[PDB]
Design a protein around this motif. Structure first.
Motif, PDB file in Angstrom:
ATOM      1  N   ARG A 123       0.847  -1.179   0.000  1.00 24.60           N
ATOM      2  CA  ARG A 123       0.000   0.000   0.000  1.00 24.60           C
ATOM      3  C   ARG A 123       0.887   1.235   0.000  1.00 24.60           C
ATOM      4  O   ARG A 123       2.050   1.187   0.408  1.00 24.60           O
ATOM      5  CB  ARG A 123      -0.968   0.012   1.196  1.00 24.60           C
ATOM      6  CG  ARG A 123      -0.367   0.440   2.524  1.00 24.60           C
ATOM      7  CD  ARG A 123       0.648  -0.554   3.036  1.00 24.60           C
ATOM      8  NE  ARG A 123       0.740  -0.558   4.491  1.00 24.60           N
ATOM      9  CZ  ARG A 123       1.796  -0.999   5.166  1.00 24.60           C
ATOM     10  NH1 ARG A 123       2.854  -1.461   4.514  1.00 24.60           N
ATOM     11  NH2 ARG A 123       1.797  -0.974   6.487  1.00 24.60           N
TER      12      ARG A 123
ATOM     13  N   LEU B 255       0.665   5.078   1.515  1.00 24.07           N
ATOM     14  CA  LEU B 255      -0.041   5.763   2.593  1.00 24.07           C
ATOM     15  C   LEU B 255       0.210   7.266   2.485  1.00 24.07           C
ATOM     16  O   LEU B 255       1.363   7.707   2.494  1.00 24.07           O
ATOM     17  CB  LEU B 255       0.415   5.224   3.950  1.00 24.07           C
ATOM     18  CG  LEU B 255      -0.236   5.819   5.194  1.00 24.07           C
ATOM     19  CD1 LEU B 255      -1.730   5.583   5.155  1.00 24.07           C
ATOM     20  CD2 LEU B 255       0.372   5.226   6.455  1.00 24.07           C
TER      21      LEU B 255
ATOM     22  N   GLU C  27      -6.632   1.172  -5.786  1.00 24.64           N
ATOM     23  CA  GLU C  27      -7.069   0.414  -4.616  1.00 24.64           C
ATOM     24  C   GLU C  27      -5.957   0.225  -3.591  1.00 24.64           C
ATOM     25  O   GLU C  27      -6.250  -0.091  -2.435  1.00 24.64           O
ATOM     26  CB  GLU C  27      -7.589  -0.969  -5.025  1.00 24.64           C
ATOM     27  CG  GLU C  27      -6.488  -1.875  -5.569  1.00 24.64           C
ATOM     28  CD  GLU C  27      -6.968  -3.258  -5.979  1.00 24.64           C
ATOM     29  OE1 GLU C  27      -8.185  -3.540  -5.885  1.00 24.64           O
ATOM     30  OE2 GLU C  27      -6.108  -4.073  -6.377  1.00 24.64           O
ATOM     31  N   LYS C  28      -4.699   0.409  -3.982  1.00 22.09           N
ATOM     32  CA  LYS C  28      -3.578   0.274  -3.067  1.00 22.09           C
ATOM     33  C   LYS C  28      -3.114   1.600  -2.477  1.00 22.09           C
ATOM     34  O   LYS C  28      -2.143   1.617  -1.717  1.00 22.09           O
ATOM     35  CB  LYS C  28      -2.407  -0.418  -3.772  1.00 22.09           C
ATOM     36  CG  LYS C  28      -2.587  -1.925  -3.921  1.00 22.09           C
ATOM     37  CD  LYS C  28      -1.382  -2.548  -4.602  1.00 22.09           C
ATOM     38  CE  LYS C  28      -1.210  -3.999  -4.193  1.00 22.09           C
ATOM     39  NZ  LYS C  28       0.068  -4.562  -4.719  1.00 22.09           N
TER      40      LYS C  28
ATOM     41  N   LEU D 295      -3.950   4.478   0.007  1.00 28.48           N
ATOM     42  CA  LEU D 295      -4.807   4.771   1.148  1.00 28.48           C
ATOM     43  C   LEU D 295      -4.560   6.200   1.618  1.00 28.48           C
ATOM     44  O   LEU D 295      -3.417   6.575   1.903  1.00 28.48           O
ATOM     45  CB  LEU D 295      -4.532   3.774   2.275  1.00 28.48           C
ATOM     46  CG  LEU D 295      -5.384   3.913   3.528  1.00 28.48           C
ATOM     47  CD1 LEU D 295      -6.827   3.626   3.191  1.00 28.48           C
ATOM     48  CD2 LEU D 295      -4.884   2.963   4.604  1.00 28.48           C
ATOM     49  N   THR D 296      -5.628   6.988   1.712  1.00 25.16           N
ATOM     50  CA  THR D 296      -5.539   8.374   2.154  1.00 25.16           C
ATOM     51  C   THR D 296      -6.237   8.523   3.497  1.00 25.16           C
ATOM     52  O   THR D 296      -7.380   8.084   3.660  1.00 25.16           O
ATOM     53  CB  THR D 296      -6.153   9.337   1.135  1.00 25.16           C
ATOM     54  OG1 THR D 296      -7.560   9.093   1.021  1.00 25.16           O
ATOM     55  CG2 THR D 296      -5.496   9.164  -0.223  1.00 25.16           C
ATOM     56  N   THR D 297      -5.542   9.143   4.451  1.00 25.91           N
ATOM     57  CA  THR D 297      -6.032   9.350   5.806  1.00 25.91           C
ATOM     58  C   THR D 297      -5.705  10.781   6.218  1.00 25.91           C
ATOM     59  O   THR D 297      -5.227  11.582   5.407  1.00 25.91           O
ATOM     60  CB  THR D 297      -5.397   8.352   6.786  1.00 25.91           C
ATOM     61  OG1 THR D 297      -4.095   8.820   7.158  1.00 25.91           O
ATOM     62  CG2 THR D 297      -5.257   6.959   6.167  1.00 25.91           C
ATOM     63  N   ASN D 298      -5.990  11.123   7.478  1.00 23.83           N
ATOM     64  CA  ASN D 298      -5.510  12.405   7.974  1.00 23.83           C
ATOM     65  C   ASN D 298      -4.016  12.314   8.319  1.00 23.83           C
ATOM     66  O   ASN D 298      -3.421  11.233   8.378  1.00 23.83           O
ATOM     67  CB  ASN D 298      -6.337  12.896   9.173  1.00 23.83           C
ATOM     68  CG  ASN D 298      -6.127  12.081  10.434  1.00 23.83           C
ATOM     69  OD1 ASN D 298      -5.040  12.060  11.007  1.00 23.83           O
ATOM     70  ND2 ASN D 298      -7.190  11.458  10.910  1.00 23.83           N
TER      71      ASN D 298
ATOM     72  N   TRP E  88      -2.238  12.727  11.018  1.00 21.25           N
ATOM     73  CA  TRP E  88      -1.790  12.054  12.231  1.00 21.25           C
ATOM     74  C   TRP E  88      -1.949  10.545  12.114  1.00 21.25           C
ATOM     75  O   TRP E  88      -1.089   9.787  12.580  1.00 21.25           O
ATOM     76  CB  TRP E  88      -2.551  12.601  13.440  1.00 21.25           C
ATOM     77  CG  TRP E  88      -2.885  14.059  13.322  1.00 21.25           C
ATOM     78  CD1 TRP E  88      -4.127  14.623  13.412  1.00 21.25           C
ATOM     79  CD2 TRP E  88      -1.971  15.137  13.068  1.00 21.25           C
ATOM     80  NE1 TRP E  88      -4.040  15.983  13.241  1.00 21.25           N
ATOM     81  CE2 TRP E  88      -2.729  16.324  13.023  1.00 21.25           C
ATOM     82  CE3 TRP E  88      -0.588  15.214  12.867  1.00 21.25           C
ATOM     83  CZ2 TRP E  88      -2.149  17.577  12.795  1.00 21.25           C
ATOM     84  CZ3 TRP E  88      -0.012  16.461  12.635  1.00 21.25           C
ATOM     85  CH2 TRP E  88      -0.793  17.624  12.606  1.00 21.25           C
ATOM     86  N   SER E  89      -3.038  10.087  11.493  1.00 21.32           N
ATOM     87  CA  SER E  89      -3.186   8.656  11.259  1.00 21.32           C
ATOM     88  C   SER E  89      -2.032   8.121  10.427  1.00 21.32           C
ATOM     89  O   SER E  89      -1.521   7.027  10.690  1.00 21.32           O
ATOM     90  CB  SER E  89      -4.517   8.373  10.571  1.00 21.32           C
ATOM     91  OG  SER E  89      -5.597   8.778  11.391  1.00 21.32           O
TER      92      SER E  89
ATOM     93  N   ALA F 266      -5.323  11.098  15.535  1.00 24.18           N
ATOM     94  CA  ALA F 266      -5.389  10.022  14.567  1.00 24.18           C
ATOM     95  C   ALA F 266      -6.697   9.252  14.746  1.00 24.18           C
ATOM     96  O   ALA F 266      -7.417   9.416  15.735  1.00 24.18           O
ATOM     97  CB  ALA F 266      -4.181   9.099  14.716  1.00 24.18           C
TER      98      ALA F 266
ATOM     99  N   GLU G 124      -8.533   4.255  10.453  1.00 21.71           N
ATOM    100  CA  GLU G 124      -7.559   4.530   9.401  1.00 21.71           C
ATOM    101  C   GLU G 124      -6.234   3.836   9.691  1.00 21.71           C
ATOM    102  O   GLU G 124      -5.624   3.248   8.790  1.00 21.71           O
ATOM    103  CB  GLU G 124      -7.351   6.039   9.256  1.00 21.71           C
ATOM    104  CG  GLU G 124      -8.612   6.816   8.931  1.00 21.71           C
ATOM    105  CD  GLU G 124      -8.358   8.305   8.745  1.00 21.71           C
ATOM    106  OE1 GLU G 124      -7.336   8.814   9.256  1.00 21.71           O
ATOM    107  OE2 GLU G 124      -9.194   8.972   8.099  1.00 21.71           O
TER     108      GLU G 124
END
Ligand SMILES: NC(=O)c1ccc[n+]([C@@H]2O[C@H](COP(=O)([O-])OP(=O)(O)OC[C@H]3O[C@@H](n4cnc5c(N)ncnc54)[C@H](O)[C@@H]3O)[C@@H](O)[C@H]2O)c1
Ligand SMILES: NC(=O)c1ccc[n+]([C@@H]2O[C@H](COP(=O)([O-])OP(=O)(O)OC[C@H]3O[C@@H](n4cnc5c(N)ncnc54)[C@H](O)[C@@H]3O)[C@@H](O)[C@H]2O)c1
Ligand SMILES: O=c1ccn([C@@H]2O[C@H](COP(=O)(O)OP(=O)(O)O[C@H]3O[C@H](CO)[C@@H](O)[C@H](O)[C@H]3O)[C@@H](O)[C@H]2O)c(=O)[nH]1
Ligand SMILES: O=c1ccn([C@@H]2O[C@H](COP(=O)(O)OP(=O)(O)O[C@H]3O[C@H](CO)[C@@H](O)[C@H](O)[C@H]3O)[C@@H](O)[C@H]2O)c(=O)[nH]1
Ligand SMILES: [Cl-]
Lengths: 460, 460, 129
Positions: free
Chosen positions: A177, A179, A206-207, A209-212, A214-215, B246, B250
């Motif tokens: 993935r 990130l 699909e591989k 991955l988007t987060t905030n 800090w995550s 976080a 996620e």
């Protein structure tokens, strides 16, 4: 909306070099410039002998260098024209002051943040790639906001790296993935999506991955902690096996066939090494203490304590088996790297096992087929190294006249040594301490030859 | 070449029933007799309504009950004619004496071993299927040897079960692996191969794992401990997420996409329940203390301590959010089973969350769509239950006039409730405490309604 | 379980702070069925010492062979001389198997080979098993 066409990466090390080489290889219409204050390393990146060896790296670099891939010491100009700035500098554990041995030293990250905002105008996406503490991007945003110019719009992202030593090119071309972390703001999402478009040149959506933000920062630390926990968990089981008559390889196999658990990272060992497992777990523990989470802190501390206990009890097993004294005894150390098929020794268990035997006055003869001899001397230094440490040229010299053979690294050649020959020139009784389970299936032969063979996770 | 043709199983409970039903279904030429001292349970197996419910189980018994599958109370005769004897009796945690709350009570196992060696002549294979402490088969072998007869050859094997609630028939027909442990002697290896031949009727050969007896017993305990460790690890991260911004979902996704870590058992929660996780981890800790392995003991103790901390801090979060007092306040407890789609409540986090709020004098209104109300009363009892606990028959009655809604079980219907209706009749301010992340994606709509929504692993 | 000897030492009926009290309470906490014989301690005293359960778990035998009949183990806590002279082949025949002797006073020293030949697993303080 915005399209990244020029990329600058600050830090031409184990991460910045290969990652940018692959991006350049996969994105022909994107100029990629890697910069570093270390001129010898930069000149090495332009020389036909690269400063870091990774299978397939030479072919990738040589196919792009001069066309759309560049290595330079001109940091300020590369920042000036880049749409995207990768921060890939080192973040070593602080060896001083408050948080010694646990906290990360952020002085190199801050130097980048200062130098970036000093040489920047307009719109740029700044992406944290180095392993940083959680909320470090908040520090970068504060520095940028406190030194802002008119029309200066710097967006900060998190984009950790998950490559492992030895398979970097395969991991970069086919990652489990990618990130990316950013703010939940309209500006942040435009910067996240712009960086996604780069990786979409060769990574399936699909591989990605988007987060905030800090995550993303926390995920890099937690991922390495989960991996280290699997090793420490199976090593804790190895100690149970030695006291009960179970076999850790049989137990690991039985555990690993549960597909919810998985069968990876269940090889018992004298202890995990590498430059990031202990560093990232300890950073996690330090972060939890700073955030007043002592239960979480002591939960993850057990991964480190267990790894240290696995090392110490292995050294104790050697000393106890050798009639409680190893002063002036010759002991062969087969394997010094923290894993096979590398010369990296950072936090290798061989270092700690060797120092334990040195504290007892043992005469160590160390052989590793790839680790440079100058590195072993440096690692065992704080004299004691001159009196006790000898670096052999081949394993048979290290085992000549030795009381015990201690295997700490799973090099495949150790499985194929002539042990009837080794037994003849060893002092009796002769011991083999397999700290990696590399001699499994050979115990009946070794016992018939006359060795007392002891390994981790098997009752004596 | 010995051949198992008649099988007796002592214990017609959650394990003995389904396992023998599947063996009968897949081995038509093998007589399978499941015996038990409970006559009401034995008759329920012969009745058109089974005592334990598992999807697809009713079809399996009805297709074999009378052909080669039988449920009798004649224990002595079934032992007399069997070539293979399964021990599938209960092994509860000792509630008394030395090892209270950690060690397993083996009195039922011993009752089988004595009764078997009394009602046995010739050659028989005795197989441990219950979850037993390591080296429990050594105790069974001592009973057999101390009560030996002429022509009496009893072989002892270990064959643990790994089925889970809700998928027992699926797990038994297509297991990830079948684990068989026996002594590494010709007598033992012969007994191992005979039991493999039974499973080889429908399990691929590579999925049948043969080990020594101790590895098999230890693998059952360690497998559950590894699973519980994943939940406690991701729960420890959930606390870190709440303090850093976080998001645990996620982070868990990012961690789980590493194929070496896997994406199973990474769902943060108020705490894991069930009848075997805490019992097997605590038993493992007790075993390590008896064997002088305190480092290993405190390593695995952290799995339980983290699970207890996750529960206590969730209860403290409710109390702190409700202006530090919940005495005489109405609180709705949505979900009492230890997981969704079951009525089992053993070691359910709902029990402990409820008792924490009861200690504060809260008025609990508990709704679960499947748990019998009499079970809830038993779980919350030692009075206090009469004054504080009310068992609702739909969620809206439980939320009528309540200060907070506490979701402890991930029942799918809780996501589909009418929260505008619930908010109108709740005291203000109204809180929702999501201990299962079941309301993810609904936070904006719930906040617009006027709820203060709090969930594990998400900053408030 | 047979408890042979309840006085704190031989040639007395005094039980004050006797180790037999504490050994018995440990086994009673485990739910064992204790059959206690002491040739001089009054039976009413044994009940008082084990009290605050005594009815369910504690039985006071009138001779040692009654106490060892059908027992899993024989626990010797007092060094009474008569214990050295018991008929252990007779005791072994009516004991459940395996049959154990736990000698807390070293009174059966020198008799271990005979007891092992009879079929006892004999364990004593200060001797490796
Ligand atoms: N080693 C790995 O496999 C790996 C894997 C994933 C994540 N990481 C993380 O990636 C980061 C980089 O690791 P690495 O092994 O590539 O480090 P490295 O030390 O090999 O590379 C960093 C490079 O940056 C240069 N540098 C430092 N400060 C600079 C500055 N202000 N301006 C310009 N150049 C500067 C250094 O001279 C060095 O050449 C670390 O934080 C590490 O934890 C490492
Ligand atoms: N999902 C699970 O519940 C599961 C999974 C794997 C392993 N296990 C283990 O399997 C074992 C059995 O669990 P269970 O849920 O089936 O228990 P249970 O209480 O449902 O079944 C045990 C049965 O044995 C009978 N029994 C007890 N002693 C007996 C004796 N001396 N003679 C005859 N019958 C006797 C009892 O009356 C009862 O019907 C336990 O050790 C448990 O830890 C449980
Ligand atoms: O079952 C196992 C697996 C690994 N190890 C040991 O664990 C250490 C780490 O090995 P490995 O993870 O393969 O090497 P690294 O190059 O350190 O890679 C890790 O560290 C990198 C640096 O952060 C991360 O990016 C990677 O995801 C992570 O795999 C070594 O000492 C191994 O011998 C074991 O003892 N048993
Ligand atoms: O990501 C997760 C997965 C599970 N759980 C909880 O973990 C507990 C156990 O769930 P599960 O493992 O499905 O329940 P069991 O039916 O008890 O099954 C377990 O226990 C059996 C022994 O009783 C083993 O045979 C099985 O392999 C093992 O899955 C429950 O409270 C779940 O809510 C979580 O909180 N997060
Ligand atoms: Cl400090």
């Amino acid at each position: 909306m915005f399209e990244i066409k020029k990329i600058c990466c600050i830090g031409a090390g184990y991460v910045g070099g290969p990652t940018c080489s692959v991006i350049a290889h996969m994105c022909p219409e994107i100029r990629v410039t890697v910069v570093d204050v270390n001129e010898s390393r930069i000149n090495a990146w332009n020389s036909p002998t690269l400063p870091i060896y990774e299978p397939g790296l030479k072919e990738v670099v040589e196919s792009c260098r001069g066309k759309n891939l560049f290595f330079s010491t001109n940091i300020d100009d590369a920042i000036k024209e880049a749409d995207l700035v990768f921060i890939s500098v080192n973040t070593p554990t602080k060896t001083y002051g408050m948080g010694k041995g646990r906290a990360l030293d952020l002085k190199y990250i801050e130097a980048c943040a200062r130098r970036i905002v000093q040489n920047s105008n307009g719109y740029k996406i700044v992406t944290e790639k180095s392993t940083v503490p959680v909320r470090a991007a908040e520090s970068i945003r504060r520095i940028f906001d406190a030194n802002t110019k008119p029309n200066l719009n710097l967006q900060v992202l998190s984009n950790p790296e998950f490559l492992a030593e030895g398979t970097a090119i395969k991991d970069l071309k086919n990652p489990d993935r990618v990130l990316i972390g950013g703010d939940e703001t309209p500006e942040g999402q435009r910067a996240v999506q712009a960086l996604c478009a780069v990786y979409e040149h060769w990574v399936p959506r699909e591989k990605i991955l988007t987060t905030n933000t800090w995550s993303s920062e926390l995920s890099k630390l937690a991922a390495n902690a989960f991996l280290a926990q699997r090793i420490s968990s199976i090593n804790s089981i190895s100690a149970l096996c030695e006291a009960t008559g179970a076999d850790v390889e049989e137990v690991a196999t039985a555990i690993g066939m549960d597909q919810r658990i998985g069968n990876k990272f269940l090889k018992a060992s004298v202890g995990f090494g590498g430059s990031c497992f202990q560093k990232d777990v300890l950073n996690l523990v330090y972060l939890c203490e700073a955030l007043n989470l002592p239960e979480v802190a002591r939960y993850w501390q057990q991964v480190i304590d267990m790894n240290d206990y696995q090392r110490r009890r292995f050294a104790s097993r050697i000393i106890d088996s050798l009639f409680n004294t190893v002063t002036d005894k010759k002991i062969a150390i087969l394997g010094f790297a923290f894993k096979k098929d590398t010369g990296d020794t950072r936090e290798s268990s061989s270092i700690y096992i060797s120092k334990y035997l040195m504290d007892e006055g043992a005469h160590l003869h160390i052989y590793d087929p790839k680790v440079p001899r100058e590195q072993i001397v440096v690692d065992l230094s704080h004299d004691q190294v001159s009196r006790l440490v000898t670096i052999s040229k081949d394993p048979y010299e290290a085992c000549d006249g030795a009381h015990a053979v201690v295997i700490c690294t799973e090099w495949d050649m150790f499985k194929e040594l002539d042990y009837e020959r080794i037994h003849k020139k060893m002092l009796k009784p002769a011991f083999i301490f397999d700290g990696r389970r590399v001699l499994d299936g050979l115990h009946n032969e070794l016992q018939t030859i006359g060795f007392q063979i002891e390994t981790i996770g098997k009752k004596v």
